């Protein structure tokens, strides 16, 4: 694409500069270019990819929520008609958000997932696939909403199955997958009991494995375990 003429290593270097400068759209474009070189991504590079797009879509999701809330208020009884503008602009933001999700899902399908054989890579990418279908589900209101939800579910479930077989219960990728799948259950699938069960079982199995870890690994795992606890506290 636009990044076709830039060296892979230069794209990676510039993604890191973009991160330092908090230029996440640039970072994402650099990492898209790197993926399109066709080589597999290292661990560091996978995390650059995920950071970039998470920040871009995160901003779009926050904006969408603002606009949706305004739109909902406009449609209450007693609200003065303001014309089509709120809907139009929410739709604009929504369409851009869907585009970013489609771009990420496209990179995963062409061809990151199919070349990912190690558990750490494959689970990472399947978690991403679940996440970006979850973002699509957040804004879905039509005939395909069930199918979008099921696509998220299926990706998370495959990641979960691999992670349970191939990773220790304290592995940060495994933990973060479970955190997010739990939120999927609560917020998307209308399954709060499943969400709570998953978060609690994940926490407790991780706590039992902390004894095996170095100081630095312990720090990494306990950080995510605290997020599980934070959600459990929100939900109970």
């Amino acid at each position: 694409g636009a990044m076709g003429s830039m060296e892979r290593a230069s794209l990676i270097q510039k993604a890191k500069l973009a991160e330092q400068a908090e230029r996440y759209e640039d970072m994402a474009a650099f990492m898209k270019g790197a993926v399109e070189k066709g080589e597999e991504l290292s661990c560091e590079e996978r995390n650059l990819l995920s950071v970039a797009y998470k920040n871009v879509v995160g901003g779009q999701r926050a904006a969408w929520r603002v606009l949706s809330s305004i739109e909902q208020k406009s449609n209450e009884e007693g609200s003065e008609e303001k014309g089509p503008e709120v809907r139009e602009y929410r739709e604009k933001v929504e369409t851009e958000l869907q585009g970013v999700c489609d771009t990420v899902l496209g990179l995963l399908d062409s061809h990151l997932i199919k070349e990912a054989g190690d558990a750490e890579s494959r689970v990472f990418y399947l978690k991403m696939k679940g996440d970006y279908y979850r973002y699509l589900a957040e804004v879905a209101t039509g005939d395909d909403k069930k199918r979008i939800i099921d696509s998220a579910r299926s990706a998370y479930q495959e990641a979960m199955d691999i992670s349970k077989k191939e990773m220790p219960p304290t592995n940060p990728i495994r933990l973060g997958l479970a955190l997010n799948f739990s939120v999927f259950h609560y917020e998307i699938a209308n399954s709060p009991e499943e969400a709570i069960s998953l978060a609690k079982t994940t926490f407790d199995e991780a706590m039992a494995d902390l004894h095996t870890l170095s100081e630095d690994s312990y720090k990494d795992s306990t950080l995510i375990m605290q997020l599980l606890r934070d959600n459990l506290t929100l939900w109970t």
């Binding site: 996440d131 973060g176 955190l179 997010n180 939120v183 917020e187 995510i224 997020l227 934070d230 959600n231």
Partner: peptide, 5 residues
């Protein structure tokens, strides 16, 4: 909103 990573 709940925490995700």
């Amino acid at each position: 909103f709940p925490a995700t990573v």
